[PDB]
Amino acid sequence: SVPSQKTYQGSYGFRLGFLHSGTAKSVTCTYSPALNKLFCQLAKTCPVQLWVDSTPPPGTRVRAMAIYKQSQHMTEVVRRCPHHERCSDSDGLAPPQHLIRVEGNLRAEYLDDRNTFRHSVVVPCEPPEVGSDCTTIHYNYMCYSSCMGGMNRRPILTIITLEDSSGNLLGRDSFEVRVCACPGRDRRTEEENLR
Numbered sequence: 172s173v174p175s176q177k178t179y180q181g182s183y184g185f186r187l188g189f190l191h192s193g194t195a196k197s198v199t200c201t202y203s204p205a206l207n208k209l210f211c212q213l214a215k216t217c218p219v220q221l222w223v224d225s226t227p228p229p230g231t232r233v234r235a236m237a238i239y240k241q242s243q244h245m246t247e248v249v250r251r252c253p254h255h256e257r258c259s260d261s262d263g264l265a266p267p268q269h270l271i272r273v274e275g276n277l278r279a280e281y282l283d284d285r286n287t288f289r290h291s292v293v294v295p296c297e298p299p300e301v302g303s304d305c306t307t308i309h310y311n312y313m314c315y316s317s318c319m320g321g322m323n324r325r326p327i328l329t330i331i332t333l334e335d336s337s338g339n340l341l342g343r344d345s346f347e348v349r350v351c352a353c354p355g356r357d358r359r360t361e362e363e364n365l366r
């Protein structure tokens with residue numbers, strides 16, 4: 172009924188990494204370590220790094236799924252709102268109902284779970300380019316946290332799972348996400364509230 176969100180590095184020492192983009196009002200995507208929360212604009216590139224201590228087997232994949240953060244909403248499938256699922260902004264691969272898309276990866280697969288009805292996007296786990304120490308996936312969130320009839324101001328978490336070729340768990344990490352008009356200002360505000 173509810174996907175696990177327990178951090179698990181697993182045998183390969185799997186964990187996420189985020190850039191340090193700052194909080195200028197112009198920033199389009201910014202991550203707060205103190206809040207473990209990514210703030211981003213609608214449909215803008217969200218670079219998420221994948222780090223491992225050892226190389227996982229050929230066929231390993233990386234899946235992203237969103238769930239509501241509040242327990243009383245956790246059984247509800249996170250999906251795009253009645254407006255955005257109908258705006259015909261398809262990239263040719265992602266179903267119009269899916270909140271999370273992967274940018275620039277023709278091998279991305281989108282799943283509508285036949286039992287839970289939850290949405291997810293999965294890609295092959297690739298090694299870093301020569302000269303790099305990690306691999307980066309570029310995600311896009313396709314609705315604002317405030318969209319009526321959809322997330323409707325409810326906070327969500329994105330769960331990233333490292334899986335084997337059968338879909339079995341190898342590792343897991345997660346972070347809260349707020350899709351908003353001014354990520355820099357909102358990150359500053361929430362960090363101040365926390366302080």
Ligand SMILES: [Zn+2]
Nearest residue numbers: 252255314318
């Ligand atoms: Zn929307």
